[model samples]
Target: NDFHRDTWAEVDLDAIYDNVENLRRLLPDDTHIMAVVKANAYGHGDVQVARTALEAGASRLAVAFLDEALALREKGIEAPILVLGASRPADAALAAQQRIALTVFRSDWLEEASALYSGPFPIHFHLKMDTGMGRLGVKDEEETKRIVALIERHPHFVLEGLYTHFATADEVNTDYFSYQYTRFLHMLEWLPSRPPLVHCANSAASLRFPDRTFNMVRFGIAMYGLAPSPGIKPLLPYPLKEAFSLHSRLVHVKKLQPGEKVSYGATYTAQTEEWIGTIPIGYADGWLRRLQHFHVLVDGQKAPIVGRICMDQCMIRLPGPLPVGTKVTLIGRQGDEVISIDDVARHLETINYEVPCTISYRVPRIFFRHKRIMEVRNAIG
Candidate 1:
């Protein structure tokens, strides 16, 4: 382990397999699962998660952007992938050439994409519907129909799927969710024949609404073993085992002089003589400055995070003089105590998905399976 740096993110492939497999077993066997591996698989490392997820039983993959999908292709991931976000007309041709699917919304997108797509073979694409997302997709039925018909006749493209994003599927006030569902259902009636894949549910929808599975599910955050939100966690069929954990070893230990400040801005001071530990992870590694009064696990006990988290390091108030090189857990289990990702998200006042993605890639990712090292991705090295 000394071969690598001090701060590292441990990714449990076993937990990932368990999560995806559990979802596979619970959902209808016919329901295809498109594991969402965007944002570097929510900072768990995309290629690693993608391979493990497919071996665990995902049919296809989904990423938020075109380059993200292409990265997988470059890495020998030949699985079907859909770029959930829009791509430029110029990029559409390359996407077609490579066999990666693009999310087309506007009818005029075809006119320009067709001009650019010198495709000897047709481009595979999924049409985005504006049921409720309102972010992308053509809402006008005439426009939607025009795009569908255009793909049917336009020699350059083939409509492979149709999907809409839910605005509040996981929320308690599901009226808006029902509204979106009805709209999506109504929108489907306009189709002459549905595309091979028709999916609308995200992780939240997959867990709460079985009826909306619609032949496929975009299993994203939950596939990484995180709850969509605090509200939806308890209602999931099976408990999700978190797969990502942040860890670092105490590099330095010291006795702080009374009244001496810790970190910049003097945010925290030694009220009396105190034992402090310096860790090599900070805001740059997702330990944000605002994360004051938080605690980390040390020697199976809680150590108060003391001082504003810096860009490269932070100080934690330990109970006593723990020896140098002692292990500390920022987000993981230690003995009977645990600092869950949900806890981190809650403290940040945001959803769980954002927390892990904020963890920098500079921190090495050590992938483990069956409690042994599977692979290590060290961007720094």
Candidate 2:
């Protein structure tokens, strides 16, 4: 029998497919959808979600780093994988060797990369233009021109596409989004010809700005059935489904008398004789300490987390009583009431992205397909 006291994040593959299909219906025939599976698909299990996205309609996959791409490749994913973030110049050769497309903005770096290798390395790279993000990519017209000149001269690298990021696409203020889009269009006009592929829209832009679908859109948070933010909620044409749920077990159940303190720092005290249940998850498992006063659903009843969350456990005060080993719903549906990622985000004073990504890999992830457990994965393996 399994003896280790543990918690699990349940990932629903069907819900992921539903979200992908919903996103695909909005895009035009010419616009390619690239599923953003970075950060392990925002902590929802990248390989499983990526496979679901591809099966649903995504044409390609985009990741934030080279190592993430390598991980996907290791899983036997054959779709075109694009590394959105810049890679180390020293690792350019390795990236080329792996046949993963990369982003490049600096001309000197490309020149340096060209000198490092002897053979004809197939390096597909996107020319990044800093429209307004003040992050990566060439900003001014002079730098853009220099990059264009270098691409024309360099045969080792292929200019596979052109892209820029929208800094405030999720915000209601469209000024920055408009400026970035306009700058991107201007840069396109300056080029001798449009690159084979062009993309700019993230989840928010794709949903709100239908006119700017450019040849491709990188779907991130929305593909996981989450709205980019509260402001973009009304823009969605179809309903989406969340693909993840979190659960923990009550490891211990004890009655505390009045005046007895609970947990570290004596953050909570019993008002009367009450039942306290210890859940096998805490800050180390991604349950934020700030959620001390929040509620968890146990046996379809609301149980308030009553003490300071420790590294591996937290105490929840039950109104009546709960047996040891009763499953506690940290983020899932319990009867009619539901605890969602948004709910957790609201409690933690952050966004939904932070809520899921904060869940450390130490917790086991149980994959579900057709409402059945498919497999379990640990942190690295």
Candidate 3:
């Protein structure tokens, strides 16, 4: 009863656990799995997914920023959490106080943080090598050595890990990936002493090239059972089970005569006598305007969504006069039919990661474990 809306997302914790277990077996005995729980676990909800991944075999957790890691800390999660994005030097003291790790690249950042961190504890950090990602990382060996020397001199800083990201690991062609990996290896040689964790493989790299995943792999999309890219799906070591599903219930149902229109701008006109079902899900809830003509599953049958999707509701052309409370499957199996996030992605001409991540925080997330409801989180509240 915590969620009053009929629209909701369901996260299967068991699926998350299984994904982590599968990856753990795929990696070498010495390799560690750093579960990437950033973006609210890709909109599946973070805390539940993090706990399940840790329980399954993930040794640590990674988030994009300090606040994301801090949120996990506030939830009482004590695992080693790393902020993979830029963290402000001003927050160095707080990050150290919570034992949260930050990614460092610039020697200037280390200098700034050193002056700001008046710490009883050292702020653990990872050195990010650019290696062709062109994002946050030291660009060359000279810059890498410069940052390493600076960190070595600072008692307030500890280099716990060294890592990089591959921009093209998900592509079928490995040319760019090889180039990045070669550069990464060169940067590794520049290190005075290897940090405890030396990682670079993201979900795609971990799946397709386990041998290259130095000591730890950052498992992100694939941990939630979604492929990093369509090209990497067939290359997966094992089948990854999808953990997320979205559902909503029809709140209104009616018959439309021939030539009667539906929704905003009246873009849809009934060619024949039609039954329209309105569901309480719209762009505001992550069911965007582009998905207007997309279909949803009802009574195992596909019903094309009728006109412009309103702010809080959308209409579907039902096969018949369905009951008012009929369940709609937006991104899950419904009887003999299913509407997957991949399907929606194809329709939107976007990636599967964007699909779930856009499914906004307004929709409540229901966590399920062992086929039972574990908790319901209404993020708006």
Candidate 4:
């Protein structure tokens, strides 16, 4: 209600809480949940989800970069936050000042960071191991030892943990996952002394290999009620209730003659006297142009989108002359029909993560608790 637009996303905070609680129940009592809230909590809204996750038993927060971690701190989140991606060495002091932990891989990066960081508080860091992901992390035992020794020599550094990323934990194949786990164990053995913590379980690994999660799990996609991969669906330890749903209302409706065409390309021609409804969401709202032929839920039935999608509007062939302001469900349930994010991802030929993440910030996020509005966040407003 806070936003003027007809399009808005609904986020069920209770669902988020339940996901965390359920995941916690599967983990050891002492193990921690590092809620990954980067990319605005996969476009569900970061600050809100982070707070909810922490309250639901998560002991830590992890973001892809320093800015994301700082954004949470600005909102008065005092929980330990870790930057999962690389950070500029020059910002080490700033990170220390804010008590934000950073991931470090290269010895030179830490050397430079240590030189620049002279804060009263020690800058906590986690060692990253490149077992097979090939994205980031130290690749060898020698490099790992170098970084660990350097941290030992530097009084301003604190080695909080060492972790690795899995490249195929979501897949049915166990070869790569086993290799990475063994390699991570080997890397740990090379350390002069293991850090206070060691974690390597992502969502897929946590569900498939709970005993190997070390001490903490980076619960990302599954935390938002999404399977890491389609292959992992059948292996899910517990069902994850999705919390995000996209909705928009019809703004205009009109009957179209057989010869009349719709939208910019005029690709959709009415076969008969068909009702076309204009919705206030389009490519700009992350309803991609490719979704032109895809359908949205209206009056508990599928309504095909007609013609080309515009920047901020699109037309759908309604079942009948539906009145303006009628509800349209783009990525949620309408009656017995449910359009899950996975369904959208399948149509887009992309992952479920991208579906919600692509949803523009202009759309308001309406949070619900106990089937009632708890809060409304409108970026544009």
Note the clash tally of each candidate: 0, 0, 0, 0
lDDT of 4 by residue, 59-167 (tens): 8999999999999999899999999999999998889989999999999998787777766878898999989999999988789889999988888899999899999
Summing lDDT over every window of 10 consecutive residues in candidate 1, give the lowest-scoring window: 1-10
Instruction: For candidate 2, give the lDDT of residue 316.
Output: 89
TM-score of every prediction relative to native: 0.97, 0.96, 0.98, 0.98
Tens digits of per-residue lDDT for model 3 on 1-381?
A: 398878999999999999999988889999999999999999988898999999999989999999999999999899999999998998998899998999998988888887777669888989998999888898877888888888888877899999999999999989999999999888899898999999999999999989989999999999888989877788888998999999999999999999999887888899899899999999998999999769999999999999999888999999999898899999999888987788999999899999989988899999999999999999887
Model 4 reaches what TM-score against the true structure?
A: 0.98
- Residue 83, candidate 3: Cα error in Å is 0.3
lDDT, model 2, position 331: 94
Error of 1 at 377 (Å): 0.5
Q: Candidate 3 — what's its lDDT?
A: 0.91
- Can you write out model 1's per-residue Cα lDDT over 272-322, one digit (the tens) per residue? 988999999888878887677688999989998887888889889999999
- lDDT per residue (tens digit) for residues 291-377 in model 2: 887999999888988879999899988877778888889999989879999999998899998888889888778887788888787
Runs in model 3 deviating more than 4 A are none
